């Protein structure tokens, strides 16, 4: 038995997820060490993507732990995410097919539209011009949310949803005609300097689940991130609860999402923080600390994805 929350699709996804990224110049070997740690330790919800090429890695590490006898495959949520060389919606099953041969599993549990501006096809996930300008497509995300449905429908992808979408884009595929299947979920950055109260109100309003990324304020990894921004886990508020609950202030950041109702990943190729950070669920925050750390919000988004910036269907 493990904490979850019913999608709005029936499916249930585990309150707690194991983020798999980690900057290119990090041998692949540590994703599939850091998956299996984490399964040992107790998450049940593991979050990849295409572009982190690590499938081949992450899957692995399923495929063992599963194979080994230490979880059957429905005690193990897997996330993927499209990656935006493939909005074309003849494209979208291919996509999902290629990470399904990488991982060497029959389904996922969640696809994910990664990011809403689209780039050029091809197999390139950055694809750039002979002058290094990126090559941005035109797609109608609607139709891509069509054939995300069509995966569904073939049990591809158990559930469906996105990420990084604002509430236009959302609104877009909510209110689209003949809609099918509303998306479970809106993966973003989320965390105390960053708290997205009203994106999250919104989307409990829809019964979508916010699925908060960079919940300890991120990899900070250069160039996706300014260096100069400042570091969450230093905050003395959360330095002064975790003294406090003789605790972390990265499981303080991840208790609050989880009392607010948002679904929380973290990631650490750290076995001892991988183990510390299950321990989220053996402590609870009152409403005066939950309450202090609301206070702490100051509009930081770590994560602004420039280089995508231009295209009308950029977020942020
Ligand atoms: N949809 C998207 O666009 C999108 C964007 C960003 C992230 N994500 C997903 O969300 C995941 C997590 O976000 P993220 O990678 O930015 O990093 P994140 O979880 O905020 O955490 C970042 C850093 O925290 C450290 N950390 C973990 N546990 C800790 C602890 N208990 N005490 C102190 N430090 C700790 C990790 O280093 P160690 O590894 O050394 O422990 C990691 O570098 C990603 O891996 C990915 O699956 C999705
Ligand atoms: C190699 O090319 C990429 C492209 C997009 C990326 C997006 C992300 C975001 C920050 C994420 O989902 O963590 C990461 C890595 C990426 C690598």
């Given at each position: 038995?493990?904490?979850?929350?019913?999608?709005?699709?029936?499916?249930?996804?585990?309150?707690?997820?194991?983020?798999?990224?980690?900057?290119?110049?990090?041998?692949?070997?540590?994703?599939?060490?850091?998956?299996?740690?984490?399964?040992?330790?107790?998450?049940?919800?593991?979050?990849?993507?295409?572009?982190?090429?690590?499938?081949?890695?992450?899957?692995?590490?399923?495929?063992?732990?599963?194979?080994?006898?230490?979880?059957?495959?429905?005690?193990?949520?897997?996330?993927?995410?499209?990656?935006?060389?493939?909005?074309?919606?003849?494209?979208?099953?291919?996509?999902?097919?290629?990470?399904?041969?990488?991982?060497?599993?029959?389904?996922?549990?969640?696809?994910?539209?990664?990011?809403?501006?689209?780039?050029?096809?091809?197999?390139?996930?950055?694809?750039?011009?002979?002058?290094?300008?990126?090559?941005?497509?035109?797609?109608?995300?609607?139709?891509?949310?069509e054939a995300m449905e069509k995966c569904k429908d073939a049990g591809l992808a158990k559930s469906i949803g996105v990420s990084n979408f604002n509430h236009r884009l959302l609104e877009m595929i909510l209110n689209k005609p003949g809609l099918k299947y509303k998306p479970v979920?809106?993966?973003?950055?989320?965390?105390?300097?960053?708290?997205?109260?009203?994106?999250?109100?919104?989307?409990?309003?829809?019964?979508?689940?916010?699925?908060?990324?960079?919940?300890?304020?991120?990899?900070?990894?250069?160039?996706?991130?300014?260096?100069?921004?400042?570091?969450?886990?230093?905050?003395?508020?959360?330095?002064?609860?975790?003294?406090?609950?003789?605790?972390?202030?990265?499981?303080?950041?991840?208790?609050?999402?989880?009392?607010?109702?948002?679904?929380?990943?973290?990631?650490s190729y750290n076995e001892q923080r991988i183990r510390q950070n299950v321990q989220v669920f053996e402590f609870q925050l009152t409403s005066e600390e939950m309450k202090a750390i609301d206070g702490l919000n100051r509009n930081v988004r770590y994560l602004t994805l420039d280089?995508?910036?231009?295209?009308?269907?950029?977020?942020?």
């Amino acid at each position: 038995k493990y904490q979850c929350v019913k999608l709005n699709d029936g499916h249930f996804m585990p309150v707690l997820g194991f983020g798999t990224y980690a900057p290119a110049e990090v041998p692949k070997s540590k994703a599939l060490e850091a998956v299996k740690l984490a399964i040992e330790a107790g998450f049940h919800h593991i979050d990849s993507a295409h572009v982190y090429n690590n499938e081949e890695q992450v899957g692995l590490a399923i495929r063992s732990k599963i194979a080994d006898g230490s979880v059957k495959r429905e005690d193990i949520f897997y996330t993927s995410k499209l990656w935006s060389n493939s909005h074309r919606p003849e494209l979208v099953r291919p996509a999902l097919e290629r990470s399904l041969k990488n991982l060497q599993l029959d389904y996922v549990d969640l696809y994910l539209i990664h990011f809403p501006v689209s780039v050029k096809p091809g197999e390139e996930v950055i694809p750039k011009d002979e002058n290094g300008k990126i090559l941005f497509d035109t797609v109608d995300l609607c139709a891509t949310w069509e054939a995300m449905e069509k995966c569904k429908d073939a049990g591809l992808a158990k559930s469906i949803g996105v990420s990084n979408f604002n509430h236009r884009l959302l609104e877009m595929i909510l209110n689209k005609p003949g809609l099918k299947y509303k998306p479970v979920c809106n993966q973003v950055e989320c965390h105390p300097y960053f708290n997205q109260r009203k994106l999250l109100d919104f989307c409990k309003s829809k019964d979508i689940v916010l699925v908060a990324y960079s919940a300890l304020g991120s990899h900070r990894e250069e160039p996706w991130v300014d260096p100069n921004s400042p570091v969450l886990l230093e905050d003395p508020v959360l330095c002064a609860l975790a003294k406090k609950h003789k605790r972390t202030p990265a499981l303080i950041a991840l208790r609050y999402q989880l009392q607010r109702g948002v679904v929380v990943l973290a990631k650490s190729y750290n076995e001892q923080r991988i183990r510390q950070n299950v321990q989220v669920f053996e402590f609870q925050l009152t409403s005066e600390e939950m309450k202090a750390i609301d206070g702490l919000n100051r509009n930081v988004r770590y994560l602004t994805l420039d280089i995508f910036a231009g295209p009308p269907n950029y977020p942020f």
